[PDB]
């Protein structure tokens, strides 16, 4: 792993044949498509990867297979978030055993607590982990953000090397950048792709952007444009990312519109299965048709 | 397994010697204490049982040990809620194999947009279950409740036999009571013990009350007084229940003060280990001191 | 003014002829209907009264007319809640000048982050008020409820005589009842009519029940049956209340289904105008016809 | 007045001598300070102006004095949001009679169920207003945003000329930019100052930034550097903005710390009274001491 991890780091979907069956052939296709597209690392079992909805055995298979297929060509980050900390540590050990480079952890959804309790949780977790850690802020779930100073503090431990934000809240994100400005080796990553460009312009290291599963070259181009402040390219490419956001992710009449749209598009592009794990369901033909048309209108 | 299941149905704590180690001897003492205290069933892996936060292995051990120790003396209800439907169904099958009488299920936190999907979720789930099911309304995470009409509809399935609510919202609970009033065999249970008495007075079948881990006799006596509308006795005992609620469940400074306080008291009562699994930080001395004091004020 | 205030205390709708015009004749009829139905006090400018949606002028007119019409026959409670403390104290002073007996206040949404601030809010407001005060827990907006210990502490002031909860959370309500049980002059009132009976059974003093605008005698009868633990009557009458709840309050597709249903019924019953103030609007005929039908089926 | 309204548009504090008494002399000093500082408009009775917590009388005095003092030198925008539509329309008419240029409106917190109802709210409001309107997305209360398509739709009305976002969610803001990209005349403004630079870089028209009460030149300079993509200067000035945010707005033990700090700083700077209306109260000696230290550490 490069210090600081930078660039586009797609959160892989977990392609499925069935609720409890990994689509290994499509995983292979996806990973080659990403690598050939110039992405900088692979991120497995994120939200985009349906981690929580999958069985334990299937999560282990996604890790093992991703590590096998990638064959050291790129760093692999494994999201170890789990309601059970024991199970979280076990995923971390699996990851180390199969050659992953780092783990990624958000506190459990039910862990609505104060900051001192967040700090103590991580202080007790870190000794148990065999790989460097990225902290994962996904606020909806806890109703509690890592406070900037809390990130400062946990980032003292040399086993903590970065931070991924999936708040779309950029006031919060800039507050953490400011708090971390004297530790420039600490990787500051942004989840939502719609704000990757503007965040990178202001010094964010990279984007953990789900749309890069589809069009890795687009997101890598936009990242580089933003990095070098080529403003005409930033504007032209941002409009494409935004068209995708408005057209590929908004078809659901039943929830998880982003995940269903992404997975449908991946199947339409011939990359991997669009099977979505229960209790959710893949797009049927009407919605799928809309995703087809949206895809043709991007070009 | 009485239809409708009624009375006091404690949500057992899952006693732990360590994050991943079941306190078997403490579980045995707890169960005997509950049985001798007159409760009508045992409910495992509820919120009180920390189910989300335990490993798969430990959840299974809780189920297996509880069924073994109960020895058929009381119905055992197993909460099978999980973020993964496959793990959920596995837990149900494990429960059936080990002699449990029913399962209890809430849809996963991240799930229900609306009512028609709630209906579908259960329509898909039911054919996979080997035991009768109680629906569990736990709206804290997923802002959407089961609408009254939704419960009516799901309850038509002969494999759905009741409903447990842990909203403390009794306007909602009364709305479901009215919707289900022509199905007197469908068990309507209330979680929070502070509203058990008033709900049973108005026809609820029982209370899934955590305090009964500590003092099963108090909740059983209150349930019976409510059932019989012995108002003097209802008021006398309701005060003790509220005292326990104000002094045992409020120490943490966190929403999870209830669990930490309850397990702390159970250890101070000699029943089982007080240990709460990570991620939760243990009570330090000042907090344990308040629990000890609250218990001394109740004559322990 | 009976201490503790008890029984049925309807939150009067504010009857309107237009967005900024009071329906005075309807208000007169409503008050006569409530008094004849045996209610024990009148509560104006509650959420049932559309307070926040009305102009200052119309809030003042409702206070003035309600007091004139009641002519001392029943205690009048006025909700003074407002985002401006100055405006809230102005409503309190007007209420006093026109013969109201008490004021009712919730802290504004934006203010409450903690218990110490709620204490300080009331410590600062109380010396400005010319009438006794009921505290109330703002139903939706706020993140922060009055903690039971905070209510104990605020009620150390003799100018604080009660608490009304519009949360439908009876665990919370029981926690407050328990903290206040040893103050015999302190009135504990429950807003939502669906839980009035069970709460009175366990010692609540009364109900601030919107349905009593339509059928005051029914809610009074249920209150007395609960108060006296006549369980057969409690059950019989609770079922009628729940039927109202299921059928009169559930017709709206657009929000504020309770208020639009209630006002629609009041007009169909011949009591007062159904007009609802902008930005909301009264039911049009498709929905009104359903309320009519539901009424015919009680 | 200028279409689209652009630049720095400070949400003025409402300077007070007491809970219900306007500090007229402070307000004059404040407005002269903003004008000389190069701002492009004045926005009165926003959140920063404490509108909700002030009496109707005081809100009217703020409007009247602000228009009198500005003397046509700069557009005046007036927040007319109120739980009562009758009261809101009355403030708009008062604004018009005193020569304000536009009104700013959010729907009342309780109201919005859905998008169709937001549209109808504005359809009924618009014929009643005597000035052009800016829509604004209420930061905390509503729990239902203007969807992008909703903004497109309301913006067809010639009486609606802009949009101000205070949410701090830049995924959402970029979604609305994308929806409004074919109507360049429609003014798109961001409230929170910490993300003004990044939003302007990507084409936002302006910043309704409270910190501009204290240091108008700094925010105008940052706006211009973002506008022209002068990146070295964006970085230099963003660091100062983030220092103000970290050190002036964080002294309270409260959510109120932004307002108390801003007003304390304004007083220490000789501009206007620091008085804060009940139920809040201005910083006493200790906190005031900390704010002064913070100010000396900026410069
Ligand atoms: Na059934």
Of the candidates C79, C67, C2, which has an alpha carbon nearest to the alpha carbon of residue C31? C67
Instruction: Compute the C-alpha angle A204/A205/A206, nearest 5°.
Output: 100
Three-class DSSP category at D99:
coil
Q: Which member of A110, A122, A136, A290 is catalytic?
A: A136
Three-class DSSP category at B100:
coil
Chains that touch B (3 or more CB pairs under 8 A): A, C
- The reply to whether A149 touches chain D by the CB within 8 Å rule is no
Identify the bridge partners of residue D43 per DSSP, sorted by sequence position.
D11, D77
Of the candidates B190, B235, B244, which has an alpha carbon nearest to the alpha carbon of residue B215? B244
First to last CA, chain A: 34
- The reply to whether B149 touches chain C by the CB within 8 Å rule is no
Q: How far is C233 from chain D (nearest CA, A)?
A: 37
By DSSP bridging, strand B76-79 and strand B42-44 are parallel
CB-based contact C155:C133 (threshold 8 Å): no
Between chains, do A111 and B255 touch, taking CB under 8 Å as contact? Answer: no
CB-based contact A108:A138 (threshold 8 Å): no
CB-based contact B148:B178 (threshold 8 Å): yes
What lies within 8 Å, CB to CB, of B137 at 6+ separation is: B106, B145, B146, B163, B164, B165, B166, B167
CB-based contact B150:B119 (threshold 8 Å): yes
Three-class DSSP category at A37:
coil
CB-based contact D225:D255 (threshold 8 Å): no
Residue D289 C-alpha to ligand 1 middle, in angstroms?
A: 68
- Fold adopted by B1-300: TIM Barrel (3.20.20)
Distance from C-alpha of B161 to C-alpha of B129, rounded to nearest angstrom: 13
Three-class DSSP category at A46:
coil
Chain-centroid distance of CA D94 in Å reads 19
What lies within 8 Å, CB to CB, of C158 at 6+ separation is: none
- The reply to whether A117 touches chain B by the CB within 8 Å rule is yes
Exposure of B47 by Cβ count < 10 A (0-12 exposed, 13-18 middle, 19+ buried)? Answer: buried
Mutation to test the C interface, candidates B242, B244, B246, B248, most C Cβ within 10 Å: B242
CB-based contact A162:A204 (threshold 8 Å): no
C-alpha Rg value of chain C to the nearest Å: 18
Annotated catalytic sites of C, by residue? 136, 164
Contacts of residue B253 in chain C, CB cutoff 8 Å? Answer: none
Between chains, do B281 and A108 touch, taking CB under 8 Å as contact? Answer: no
Q: How far is CA D84 from CA B277, C52, D47, D122, in A?
A: 51, 6, 17, 14
Three-class DSSP category at B179:
helix
- Fold adopted by A1-299: TIM Barrel (3.20.20)
Distance from C-alpha of C11 to C-alpha of D55, rounded to nearest angstrom: 26
CB-based contact C51:C89 (threshold 8 Å): no
Phi-psi region of C182 (alpha: psi -120 to 50; beta: other; left: phi over 0): alpha
Count CA atoms within 13 Å of residue D10 on its CB side: 26
Tokens of B200: 């049973």
Q: How far is CA C182 from CA B194, B239, C186, in A?
A: 18, 12, 9
Exposure of B294 by Cβ count < 10 A (0-12 exposed, 13-18 middle, 19+ buried)? Answer: buried
CB atoms under 10 Å from CB of B43, counted, come to: 27
Identify the bridge partners of residue D209 per DSSP, sorted by sequence position.
none
Q: How far is B105 from chain A (nearest CA, A)?
A: 13
Distance from C-alpha of C218 to C-alpha of C235, rounded to nearest angstrom: 13
Tokens of A264: 């449908």
Q: Known catalytic residue: A164?
A: yes
Contacts of residue B172 in chain C, CB cutoff 8 Å? Answer: 168
CB-based contact A61:A69 (threshold 8 Å): no
Residue B155 C-alpha to ligand 1 middle, in angstroms?
A: 4
Q: How far is D278 from chain A (nearest CA, A)?
A: 28
Of the candidates B244, B145, B228, which has an alpha carbon nearest to the alpha carbon of residue B194? B244
Distance from C-alpha of D197 to C-alpha of D222, rounded to nearest angstrom: 7
Between chains, do D181 and A239 touch, taking CB under 8 Å as contact? Answer: yes
* Kind plus residue range of the DSSP H or E element containing D111: none
First to last CA, chain D: 35
Identify the bridge partners of residue A187 per DSSP, sorted by sequence position.
A162
Between chains, do B238 and C192 touch, taking CB under 8 Å as contact? Answer: no
Q: Which residue has the tokens 């600062």?
A: C124
- The reply to whether C83 touches chain D by the CB within 8 Å rule is yes
CB-based contact B52:B21 (threshold 8 Å): no
| The three-state (H, E, C) secondary structure of chain C, written as one string | CCCCCCEECCECCCCEEECCEECHHHHHHHHHHHHHCCCCCEEECCHHHCHHHCCHHHHHHHHHHHHHHHCCCCCEEEECCCCCHHHHHHHHHHHHHCCCCEEEECCCHHHCCCHHHHHHHHHHHHHHCCCCEEEEECCCCCCCCCCHHHHHHHCCCCCEEEEEECCCEHHHHHHHHHHHCCCCCCEEEECCHHHHHHHHHCCCCEECCHHHHCCHHHHHHHHHHHHCCCHHHHHHHHHHHHHHHHHCCCCCCCCCHHHHHHHHHHHHCCCCCCCCCCCCCCCCHHHHHHHHHHHHHC
For residue A199, report the phi and psi dihedrals to the nearest 5 degrees. Answer: -70, -40
A104 in a known ligand binding site: no
Contacts of residue C111 in chain D, CB cutoff 8 Å? Answer: 279-280
Distance from C-alpha of C117 to C-alpha of D256, rounded to nearest angstrom: 12
Annotated catalytic sites of B, by residue? 136, 164
CB-based contact C89:C129 (threshold 8 Å): yes
Three-class DSSP category at D206:
strand
Tokens of B161: 């036999």
Distance from C-alpha of B28 to C-alpha of B69, rounded to nearest angstrom: 7
- The reply to whether A222 touches chain D by the CB within 8 Å rule is no
Three-class DSSP category at A49:
coil
Of the candidates D74, D68, D56, D61, which has an alpha carbon nearest to the alpha carbon of residue D7? D74
Between chains, do C170 and B174 touch, taking CB under 8 Å as contact? Answer: no
Distance from C-alpha of D134 to C-alpha of D162, rounded to nearest angstrom: 5
Distance from C-alpha of A295 to C-alpha of A293, rounded to nearest angstrom: 5
By DSSP bridging, strand C16-18 and strand C21-22 are antiparallel
Identify the bridge partners of residue A11 per DSSP, sorted by sequence position.
A43
- The reply to whether C254 touches chain D by the CB within 8 Å rule is yes
Strands (E) located in chain B: 7-8, 16-18, 21-22, 42-44, 76-79, 102-105, 133-137, 160-165, 187-190, 206-207
Between chains, do A235 and D168 touch, taking CB under 8 Å as contact? Answer: no
Tokens of C234: 């409690």
By DSSP bridging, strand A187-190 and strand A76-79 are unpaired
- Please indicate the experimental technique that yielded this structure: X-ray
Of the candidates C258, C256, C246, C244, which has an alpha carbon nearest to the alpha carbon of residue C295? C244
Chain-centroid distance of CA A62 in Å reads 15
Tokens of B285: 């001395």
Exposure of C157 by Cβ count < 10 A (0-12 exposed, 13-18 middle, 19+ buried)? Answer: middle
Q: What is the DSSP letter of A271?
A: S
Distance from C-alpha of C125 to C-alpha of A140, rounded to nearest angstrom: 36
Q: Which residue has the tokens 């000042």?
A: B286
Tokens of C284: 């049009």
Partner-chain residue, chosen from C56, C124, C140, that has the shortest CB–CB distance to D87: C56
**Cis omega (within 30 of 0) for bond into C16:** no
Identify the bridge partners of residue C22 per DSSP, sorted by sequence position.
C16
Distance from C-alpha of A86 to C-alpha of B53, rounded to nearest angstrom: 9
Distance from C-alpha of C277 to C-alpha of C190, rounded to nearest angstrom: 26
Q: How many residues does chain D have?
A: 299
Domain C1-298 superfamily per CATH:
Aldolase class I (3.20.20.70)
Exposure of A201 by Cβ count < 10 A (0-12 exposed, 13-18 middle, 19+ buried)? Answer: buried
Of the candidates A164, A146, A159, A154, which has an alpha carbon nearest to the alpha carbon of residue A205? A164
Of the candidates A162, A149, A146, A155, which has an alpha carbon nearest to the alpha carbon of residue A205? A162
For chains C and D, what is the number of CB pairs under 8 angstroms?
81
The annotation places the binding site of C for pyruvate at 48, 208
Mutation to test the C interface, candidates D56, D86, D257, D284, most C Cβ within 10 Å: D86
Identify the bridge partners of residue C79 per DSSP, sorted by sequence position.
C104
Partner-chain residue, chosen from C171, C192, C238, that has the shortest CB–CB distance to B194: C171
Instruction: Compute the C-alpha angle A198/A200/A202, nearest 5°.
Output: 75
Distance from C-alpha of C112 to C-alpha of A22, rounded to nearest angstrom: 50
What lies within 8 Å, CB to CB, of B104 at 6+ separation is: B43, B46, B77, B78, B79, B80, B81, B133, B134, B135, B136, B164
Q: How far is C176 from chain B (nearest CA, A)?
A: 10
Q: How far is CA B191 from CA A71, B46, D53, D164, in A?
A: 52, 10, 40, 45
Q: Which residue has the tokens 């605020």?
A: C154
Q: How far is B198 from chain C (nearest CA, A)?
A: 5
Q: Which residue has the tokens 């400062």?
A: A152
Contact present, C and D (at least 3 Cβ pairs less than 8 Å): yes
Virtual torsion, Cα A192, A198, A199, A204, nearest 10 deg: 120
CB-based contact B252:B281 (threshold 8 Å): no
C-alpha Rg value of chain B to the nearest Å: 18
Mutation to test the D interface, candidates C60, C110, C122, C255, most D Cβ within 10 Å: C110
Chain-centroid distance of CA D9 in Å reads 7
Partner-chain residue, chosen from D178, D239, D242, that has the shortest CB–CB distance to A246: D178
**Cis omega (within 30 of 0) for bond into D86:** no
Three-class DSSP category at A164:
strand
Mutation to test the C interface, candidates B145, B169, B184, B258, most C Cβ within 10 Å: B169
Q: What is the DSSP letter of D6?
A: -
Contacts of residue D201 in chain A, CB cutoff 8 Å? Answer: 198, 201, 231
CB atoms under 10 Å from CB of A97, counted, come to: 12
What lies within 8 Å, CB to CB, of D21 at 6+ separation is: D58
Count CA atoms within 13 Å of residue D253 on its CB side: 6
Of the candidates C226, C294, C176, C185, which has an alpha carbon nearest to the alpha carbon of residue C8? C226
Of the candidates C92, C107, C232, C221, which has an alpha carbon nearest to the alpha carbon of residue C159? C92
Distance from C-alpha of B281 to C-alpha of A85, rounded to nearest angstrom: 13
Of the candidates A144, A200, A215, A151, which has an alpha carbon nearest to the alpha carbon of residue A179? A151
Q: How far is CA A31 from CA A8, A10, A43, A164, in A?
A: 14, 10, 11, 21
**Cis omega (within 30 of 0) for bond into A89:** no
CB-based contact A186:A161 (threshold 8 Å): yes
Residue B243 C-alpha to ligand 1 middle, in angstroms?
A: 37
Distance from C-alpha of D14 to C-alpha of D62, rounded to nearest angstrom: 7
Distance from C-alpha of A107 to C-alpha of B279, rounded to nearest angstrom: 8
Phi-psi region of B132 (alpha: psi -120 to 50; beta: other; left: phi over 0): beta
Tokens of B165: 């609510």
Distance from C-alpha of A39 to C-alpha of A134, rounded to nearest angstrom: 18
Tokens of D86: 């009758």
Q: Which residue has the tokens 């892989």?
A: A12
Distance from C-alpha of D205 to C-alpha of C267, rounded to nearest angstrom: 51
Tell me the resolution in Å: 2.1
**DSSP 3-state percent helix, strand, coil across chain B (nearest 5):** 50, 10, 40
CB-based contact B68:B27 (threshold 8 Å): no
Minimal Cα distance from D21: which residue of C? Answer: C86
Of the candidates D221, D218, D168, which has an alpha carbon nearest to the alpha carbon of residue D194? D168
Identify the bridge partners of residue D76 per DSSP, sorted by sequence position.
D42
Virtual torsion, Cα C232, C238, C239, C245, nearest 10 deg: 180
Three-class DSSP category at B189:
strand
Minimal Cα distance from B283: which residue of A? Answer: A117
Chains that touch A (3 or more CB pairs under 8 A): B, D
CATH 3.40.50.720 fits D2-299, yes or no: no
Of the candidates D48, D116, D128, D135, which has an alpha carbon nearest to the alpha carbon of residue D88? D128
Handedness of CA B268, B269, B270, B273 (dihedral sign): negative
Chain-centroid distance of CA B162 in Å reads 13
Chain-centroid distance of CA A29 in Å reads 18
Of the candidates C115, C116, C150, which has an alpha carbon nearest to the alpha carbon of residue C135? C150
Of the candidates A236, A280, A235, A239, which has an alpha carbon nearest to the alpha carbon of residue A261? A280
Q: Known catalytic residue: D290?
A: no
Q: Which residue has the tokens 């701090």?
A: D168
Of the candidates D172, D143, D170, D192, which has an alpha carbon nearest to the alpha carbon of residue A169? D170
Distance from C-alpha of D229 to C-alpha of D249, rounded to nearest angstrom: 28
CB-based contact A266:A52 (threshold 8 Å): no
Q: Which member of D64, D71, D122, D136 is catalytic?
A: D136
Distance from C-alpha of D218 to C-alpha of D216, rounded to nearest angstrom: 6
Q: How far is D198 from chain A (nearest CA, A)?
A: 6
For residue B105, report the phi and psi dihedrals to the nearest 5 degrees. Answer: -145, 135
Of the candidates D147, D160, D164, which has an alpha carbon nearest to the alpha carbon of residue D48? D164
């Amino acid at each position: 792993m490069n210090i600081p991890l930078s660039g586009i780091i797609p959160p892989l979907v977990t392609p499925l044949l069935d609720d409890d069956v990994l689509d290994v052939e499509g995983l292979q296709r996806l990973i080659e498509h990403l690598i050939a597209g110039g992405v900088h690392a692979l991120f497995v079992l994120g939200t985009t990867g349906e981690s929580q909805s999958l069985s334990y055995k299937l999560r282990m298979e996604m890790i093992k297979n991703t590590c096998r297929i990638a064959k050291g060509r790129l760093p692999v980050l494994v999201c170890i978030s789990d309601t059970s900390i024991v199970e979280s540590v076990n995923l971390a050990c699996l990851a180390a055993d199969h050659g992953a480079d780092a783990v990624v952890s958000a506190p459990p959804y039910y862990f609505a607590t104060g900051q001192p309790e967040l700090i103590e949780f991580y202080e007790h977790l870190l000794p148990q982990l065999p790989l460097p850690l990225f902290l994962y802020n996904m606020p909806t779930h806890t109703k509690v953000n890592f406070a900037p100073a809390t990130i400062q503090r946990i980032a003292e431990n040399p086993g903590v090397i970065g931070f991924k934000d999936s708040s779309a809240n950029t006031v919060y994100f800039q507050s953490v950048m400011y708090a971390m400005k004297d530790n420039p080796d600490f990787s500051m990553l942004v989840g939502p792709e719609e704000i990757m460009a503007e965040s990178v312009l202001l010094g964010a290291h990279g984007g953990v952007n789900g749309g890069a599963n589809m069009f890795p070259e687009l997101y890598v181009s936009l990242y580089n444009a933003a990095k070098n402040a080529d403003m005409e390219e930033v504007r032209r490419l941002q409009e494409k990312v935004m068209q995708i956001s408005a057209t590929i992710y908004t078809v659901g009449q039943h929830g998880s519109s982003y995940l269903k749209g992404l997975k449908c598009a991946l199947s339409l592009l011939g990359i991997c299965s669009d099977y979505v794990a229960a209790p959710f369901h893949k797009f049927e033909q009407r919605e799928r048709g809309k995703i087809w048309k949206a895809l043709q209108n991007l070009g």
